[PDB]
Each structure stands twice: as C-alpha cells, then as structure tokens.
Amino acid sequence: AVIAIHGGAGAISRAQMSLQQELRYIEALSAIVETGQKMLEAGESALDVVTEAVRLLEECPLFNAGIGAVFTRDETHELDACVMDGNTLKAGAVAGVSHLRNPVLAARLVMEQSPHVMMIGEGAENFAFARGMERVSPEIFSTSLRYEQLLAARK
Amino acid sequence: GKAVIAIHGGAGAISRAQMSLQQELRYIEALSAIVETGQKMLEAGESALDVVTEAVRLLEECPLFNAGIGAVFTRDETHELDACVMDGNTLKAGAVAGVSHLRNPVLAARLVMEQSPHVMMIGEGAENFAFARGMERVSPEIFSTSLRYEQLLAARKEGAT
Amino acid sequence: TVGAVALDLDGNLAAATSTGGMTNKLPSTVGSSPLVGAGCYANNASVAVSCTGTGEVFIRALAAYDIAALMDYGGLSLAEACERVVMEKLPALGGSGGLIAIDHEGNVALPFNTEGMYRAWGYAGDTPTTGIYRE
Amino acid sequence: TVGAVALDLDGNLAAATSTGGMTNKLPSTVGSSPLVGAGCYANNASVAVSCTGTGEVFIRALAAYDIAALMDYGGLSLAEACERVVMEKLPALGGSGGLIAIDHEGNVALPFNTEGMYRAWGYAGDTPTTGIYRE
Ligand SMILES: [Cl-]
Ligand SMILES: [Cl-]
Ligand code: NA
Ligand code: NA
C-alpha cells in the first residue's frame, strides 16, 4: 500500500526562497502524505485516500488548487478537478468552477451521481448545490502570493 | 498508401423496419455528397486537416445529423454543441464544449487549434474567443428541427399546465 | 455525433468530431466528442479516429487513443485494434457506438457494436461506399 | 496543480488532480487537469497517474493514459514509461512538467523535466519522502 502527492511542477529557484519558506512546503507535503499513509495503513480505499489528500492540497494556500488558486488574466479564479476509480474505471470531473470550495469533492460527486464524466461552469456548480455542496465566493481562493505572481507575470 | 476519407453521422438504434427506401436514400444522398466533396479535395491535393474540417462542417450543416443544424435538444429545449479537430502531422488539436451561439463548432475548434496556445475552451468564453476573431454570433434557434423536437417529447413526460 | 477522418497524398492523418449530445441531456455536460483521445485522435505514426456513442464510456476507455496505442505499441492491425476496442472493451464497460479509423498505410475500418452507424468512405478518384445497417 | 495517486491494501489504484490553472490564463481555457487520460487516469490492471504542467501538451500527448498504454501494450516498466513520456514526448511537443504514478505492483515514480515539483510519497507503515528540487 502506497501514496504519492504533488503540489505542481515548474520554475522554482533556490535563489528565490529562504530555507524557512521551503520548509513550509516540505512540512505541508509531509503532513498530507502522512494523513494518506495512515488512511491506507488503516484500510481506507485508494479513492477516499486520493480524495482526502487532494482536498488537503486544495485547503493548503501554498498549492495552486482551491485556496491559493492562481489568478486568470481577468483577476478571477477558475478551478478544475478530476477523480478516477481504478476499481470501477469510473471517473468524474468539473472544469471552470468558481463557487465550489473543493473541486475534487464536486468531481467525486459527478463521478458517483452523474451519467457524465464531466460538467462545466455554473451547470457543474448547480449540480453540486442540488446535492448539498455549499456555494462560496471566488474571493476565498485569493492569496497575496498568487496575486503578486500575477502582476510579475504581467510585468 | 492511397488518399482516403471516412465519415459518420452517428451510431445507434437504426432499424430497416423504421424507414422506407426513399427515407434511407435521403441519408445515403447526404453521406455520398459529403464523402464525394472530401474525396475530390483529397484528389486535388488538399490537406487531411482541411478535408476533415470541411466534411464535419458539411455534416453540421445537414439537418439529418446531430451536430450543428439538427442538433438534439437538451432538457431545457436548447442546444449545446461540442467539437474537436486534431492534426496527425503537428499533433495540434482544438476543441470547444458547451457552445450555443456558434453555427459550426468544428470551425471554432479549428480556430482554437490554429489561433491560440490552447487545446480546449468552454461555454461563453469559447464563443467570445471565436467572436473576437470574426466568427458570427447565431441564436441557438437555428439548430432546431421538427424531427429532433418530436424526439424530445417522445423521451419525456409533459409538466402540468 | 458526426465525424471525419482522412489520409492525404502527403501521408498526413487528421480527425474531427462534432455533436449536439444526447436528447434531453442536462446542460453543461460533456461527452467524448471534444475530448482528445476519447472521441477524436490523429497521429501520423498511427491512425486518425472519430468516435460516436455512449460519451461516458468512450472517455473512460479513451477509445480513439486506445486504437492508436494498440497499433503503435501492441503492433495490432487497424482491424485487430478496432475489433478489440469496439466489439470487446466498450461493451464490457456498457459502451455502445462505433468509430471511423484510417491508419498511416491507408487502411480504413468503420466498426460499430450498434444496430447502425450512418457512414461513408472512399479513396480519392474512386466511387464512395455508404452504409447505415450492419455488415 | 495538485495531485494524489494511491494503491490501497485491497490492490485498488485511484488518482485525483485539482488546479486553478495557469497564472494569467485566458478565461474559459481547459488544461489537462479535468481531462481523463491527460491530467488524471487510474486502472487496477495498470497504473494511477496525476499530471502537472503545460496543459495543451499533456492533453495532446494523453500523458496519464500514455503511461498505462506504454506499460500494458509496449511492455515498458513504470520507470521506463515515465522517463519516455516526461523526458522525451512532452518536450518534443514543446511541453514542460511532471507526474506521479503508482502501478498495480506498488512501483512509484515522480518524474519531472521542470526546475522543481512539490512532491511526496510513502509506503504505509513507513517514513515518507519529500522533494522540491531535482534528484
Ligand atoms: Cl446499409
Ligand atoms: Cl529537494
Ligand atoms: Na490550495
Ligand atoms: Na447537422
């Protein structure tokens, strides 16, 4: 039994970070793989383990998913998630959602409760709200760090 | 290897009991006229990519087939169209999903492939991208046919009046 | 759903797929048609595929790409690959439908597991073949 | 982008991928994350994959499924399959990024061609490994 996680790949410079900044990432990554290793150890499903690990990465403002989502060219947030169950080969996905705190949870909902693999935009949101998921403002995903990265990407 | 095209206008429950020869011949006529256009383009040395684009635009135009004009109805009695195009040479692709205001989705899919760093756009944003590049806005009403409407009524119960 | 695949005189493959979905569908839903590798794929090394049928299943099975991978990596012929995906793997998942496939050698296959598939094909400078029902 | 893959004590593989996309992205664009076979794939018979990086490339290459196909049909090992996709085929399409993969035999791989990939893995009942930079 085994888990891996990622919090995204790309242009990270050692020159751009203090050890104390890098340690927040290492601490966040260890705490989430730990949660998953314990779930696995306890006999939780691969599906509930990747769902919880990605919901935690979503909650963590360090990672570009849920809270700490990057900003679009329009200074908005637009979130996408997928889950796939290797046992049934069932899959579910949402794209272009702004009002769902945990997209991977809406993805799971679509996988379990939709004839379709994929829903988009307000329709995906309304599907999720029709099944008890709460509506949030896109403002909750916004962080100072990701905003400054937008201005730097512009500038 | 010989230049060649194939086309489809969808798969499912087609029964011979359901159709006269003259009804089947509307489909055969439409399918021959589209493959023939594609075989002539190929014969002339036009690209596979331009050929599958023109063939799918013709299938969209033909109200017999469930794409563009003659699209089925949603539960909401409008039309929501999706298309993809892929170039086996460059492995470039373009796709739109959830579009209601573009006459020819496979043409918007081509636009995304050729005129963006993107593979896929969705909903109003896909349409706005397309309109910003000369593509005309249409009312979803243009896709609506009597045949597809009657199939919607056949597939449901009516709400109380 | 509608689709087109082609091999040109330069040996280039291409595929395109367009749809209005399923009658009475929930709005803001997406099937295989706009999804690279599900309802549309083209690769000069392998094949061009347009699919039509149960959207949910075509995505889960990656039908279009699976034809290409069976041929590219498994060394299956187009016919072998199309039989495997359309007549075995989609039905095992409850997938009904079909596809049109042309390989880089100009082989054509128009398999379906359904009652019919509105279909046509033809070599350049040659008379088209058309079909609705089985065979 | 964020991602999780897991093999449970029952031999089940599962994958999940979540993102807010690319900084400064055009609105209504869709990268690999919500697309089965591009940014997320799982199959008990093969592998679970989450991907992160240039979405148009991950989609065009079907990165997640291509790991599964290279193994199932190409007879590459997980390590071989992850090397070939991330170090050869993504760059060939102008693509950068990485993925996390676990096969049904418990092999784990976390390839990336980027400067870093925030990453972590651990067997059950065992000490996790974490990484940011290369090696
Ligand atoms: Cl026939
Ligand atoms: Cl490191
Ligand atoms: Na987050
Ligand atoms: Na049409």
Numbering used by the authors:
A (entry chain CCC): 4 to 158
B (entry chain AAA): 2 to 162
C (entry chain BBB), D (entry chain DDD): 179 to 313
Original authors' sentences:
l-Asparaginases hydrolyze l-asparagine to l-aspartic acid and ammonia. The prototypic class 2 enzyme is EcAIII from E. coli. EcAIII belongs to the Ntn-hydrolases, which are expressed as immature polypeptides that dimerize and then autocatalytically cleave themselves into α (∼20 kDa) and β (∼15 kDa) subunits to form the mature (αβ)2 heterotetramer (a dimer of two αβ heterodimers). The same Thr179 acts as the nucleophile in the autoproteolytic maturation and in l-asparagine hydrolysis.
Mutant RDM1-37 has a serine instead of Asp at position 210. Its Oγ atom is hydrogen-bonded via two water molecules to the side chain of Ser211, which was not replaced in this variant. Of particular interest is the case of RDM1-43, which has the same D210S substitution as mutant RDM1-37, and yet in contrast to the latter variant lost its ability to autocleave. In both RDM1-43 and RDM1-37 Ser at position 211 was preserved. Mutants RDM1-37 and RDM1-43 differ in the type of substitutions at positions 206 and 207 (206→S/V and 207→T/G, respectively). It is possible that these two differences changed the mobility (conformational disorder) of the linker and significantly lowered the probability of proper conformation and orientation at the scissile bond. Asp210 and Ser211 could be substituted individually (variant RDM1-37, D210S mutation only) or simultaneously (variants RDM1-3, RDM1-8, RDM1-12, RDM1-18, RDM1-24, RDM1-29 and RDM1-38) without any loss of autocatalytic activity.
